[PDB]
Paper text:
Stimulator of interferon genes ([name]) is an antiviral signalling protein that is broadly conserved in both innate immunity in animals and phage defence in prokaryotes. Here we use cryogenic electron microscopy to determine the structure of the active Toll/interleukin-1 receptor ([name])–[name] filament complex from a [name] cyclic-oligonucleotide-based antiphage signalling system (CBASS) defence operon. To define the molecular basis of [name] filament formation, we reconstituted signalling of the S. faecium [name]–[name] ([name]) antiphage effector in vitro and used single-particle cryo-EM to determine the structure of the activated complex. In each [name] dimer unit, the canonical V-shaped [name] CBD is positioned above two [name] enzymatic NADase domains that dock against the base of the receptor.
The partially closed 3′,3′-[name]-bound [name] conformation allows incomplete oligomerization and is incompatible with stable filamentous packing beyond about 4–6 units (or about 20 nm). Compared to the fully active [name]–c-di-GMP filament structure, 3′,3′-[name] recognition induces partial closure of the lid domain and an overall conformation of the [name] CDN-binding domain (CBD) that probably weakens contact sites observed for c-di-GMP-induced filaments. Additionally, a lack of well-defined density for the [name] domains in the 3′,3′-[name] filaments suggests conformational flexibility that may impact stability of the filaments. Our previous results demonstrate that 3′,3′-[name] binds with slightly weaker affinity (about 700 nM Kd) and is unable to induce robust [name] NADase activity, findings that are now explained by our cryo-EM analysis. Compared with the modelled open apo state and partially closed 3′,3′-[name]-bound conformations, recognition of the signal from the correct nucleotide, c-di-GMP, induces an inward rotation of the [name] β-strand ‘lid’ region of about 25° and about 9° respectively and results in formation of a tightly closed complex.
Numbering used by the authors:
A (entry chain C): 152 to 181, 184 to 227, 234 to 241, 252 to 274, 284 to 321
B (entry chain D): 153 to 227, 234 to 241, 253 to 274, 285 to 322
C (entry chain A): 152 to 180, 185 to 227, 234 to 241, 252 to 275, 285 to 322
D (entry chain B): 153 to 180, 184 to 227, 235 to 241, 252 to 275, 285 to 322
Write the structure that this text describes.
Amino acid sequence: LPSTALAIGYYNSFIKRVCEEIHGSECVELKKIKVKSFRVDVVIPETLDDNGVGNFTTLYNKRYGLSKATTCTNRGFPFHFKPVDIHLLDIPSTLSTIVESLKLYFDMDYLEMRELENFAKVLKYLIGRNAATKGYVNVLTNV
Amino acid sequence: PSTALAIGYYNSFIKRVCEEIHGSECVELEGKKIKVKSFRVDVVIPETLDDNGVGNFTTLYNKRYGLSKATTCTNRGFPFHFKVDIHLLDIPSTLSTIVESLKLYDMDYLEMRELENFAKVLKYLIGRNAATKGYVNVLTNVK
Amino acid sequence: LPSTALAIGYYNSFIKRVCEEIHGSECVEKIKVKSFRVDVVIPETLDDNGVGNFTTLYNKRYGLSKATTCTNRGFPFHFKPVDIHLLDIPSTLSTIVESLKLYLDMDYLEMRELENFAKVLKYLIGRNAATKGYVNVLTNVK
Amino acid sequence: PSTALAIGYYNSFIKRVCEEIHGSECVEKKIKVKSFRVDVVIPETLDDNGVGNFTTLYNKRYGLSKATTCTNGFPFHFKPVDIHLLDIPSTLSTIVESLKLYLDMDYLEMRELENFAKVLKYLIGRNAATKGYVNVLTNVK
Ligand SMILES: Nc1nc2c(ncn2[C@@H]2O[C@@H]3COP(=O)(O)O[C@H]4[C@@H](O)[C@H](n5cnc6c(N)ncnc65)O[C@@H]4COP(=O)(O)O[C@H]3[C@H]2O)c(=O)[nH]1
Ligand SMILES: Nc1nc2c(ncn2[C@@H]2O[C@@H]3COP(=O)(O)O[C@H]4[C@@H](O)[C@H](n5cnc6c(N)ncnc65)O[C@@H]4COP(=O)(O)O[C@H]3[C@H]2O)c(=O)[nH]1
């Protein structure tokens, strides 16, 4: 199904790049900020919307009040985080893509959370793969 | 495999950038608004991919052409490289994911297949919509 | 029937646009907002020549006030640091009567399309997340 | 389904604008009105997301000024002068959404577009207050 490719791409690029860069630098760009310990949480909506996950992302922002910061590059990676420990979290925008694929592929909702749980499984497998993400990371489904 | 990733890339990057440019006609080029009279995004696709991904080709092309990087009008910024009539060019980093999947999944022929499939689906989705049609093109068979 | 198309159009355009815009901006015309709850108001029955008289009567009886969306697509809608209690009567329902005049009971039929419109609105509110509790509908009013 | 949507658009927008312009001859300061006709132009094919993109493209290419009618409003697009009204009916977008929830796809959209245009021009011709002072232009871009 066309959910493993999205999971592979999102994990590899975003997660591996950000994790390696921040482990090699230990700092973020809020003005500059510095970090002490790392926890990245992937947030997965229970079901997708008809027109992407932008509205869900904005609702989550207003509900939790996350804060903006890219990686300290002198390839900016703007992310949302909550001498200091940082509890990073994000809702992968790539999930939006899936809905469009479905239009080119109530069975709709049933299929949708099938690919959502498959995406979560692929992410967990890729966490298991590498060591840079071997406990400094977690995922949350049915949100 | 490449089709869903291609759909996602097209949707997000192309529709967002085209819509913002059309509705604003202003890009923060070194933090200063430029005019917009005629433009089009040239998405250029490598013929072959490296074992490590696409970063090397992106670096080589950008250095050869020295394309300046800037975002779109803000008030999430979508940085892009380009050169008044703006000349937008794009190396889609998403292509890297392809090999990753094939690495987890004649090889070089398979990457060729995925690259050409990406090209065709991009061209089809560009042909459909009116926001992009005319203001975007895909340049395969490049280097 | 020709009530699901009207319901879909009304919901999508008006409700989704306004709700998303106010969630993303939190301001109207100046005034600033803290929370949202939009009440779609549905007449218990339709009239011969639309719902203009019903809308004016409701406005006088509740004394609503004007407000548009902070666009920099003016959306003139009626509302009652400050929590706003929004309500609205969809003018599109007027159109429905003409449809019947070009489709042909009348009272029961109109009640049927009104109920179908309400069901479609509730379904679409259930669909999206931007409108997942920030919206309510009110059928059989007065 | 699309027919009722077209009928509603016609009634509300066209009837109200025609009535106001004929009874006032003043639109947004106040401009005079001597002769006019609103050109409802219908896209040949629709985007997946709706009509906003085509509306923006057409308006920017033609640089159409936007203004409302007299008050004591209804916005619209146009260009001692004869008014030349124009409008992209946003309601067209609804069609695709309905057709997406309803269930060749492009051909179904073509059906809806032709039906919308036909019913629009029919209800324009039928009434007297609108006859002559309005036209629908398909086969656009
Ligand atoms: N919160 C966050 N997520 C990111 C960031 N960078 C990538 N991601 C996520 O990783 C997915 C895949 O990354 P990609 O680089 O391999 O493919 C991306 C990339 O090739 C291109 N793209 C998207 N946003 C871009 C951007 N801002 N700049 C340049 N290219 C961009 O479009 C592809 C798909 O975008 P998507 O937004 O739907 O999913 C992203 C996206 O959800 C990031 O800096 N922050
Ligand atoms: N309170 C409020 N309600 C609105 C507004 N815009 C639309 N609505 C509601 O959503 C229905 C359908 O929205 P639409 O945009 O898809 O189709 C509308 C719209 O596309 C068109 N129209 C009206 N005034 C227009 C205008 N000034 N410019 C362009 N199109 C216009 O007339 C269609 C039918 O109008 P209607 O009033 O009977 O039903 C509205 C109406 O009940 C609005 O700005 N405010």
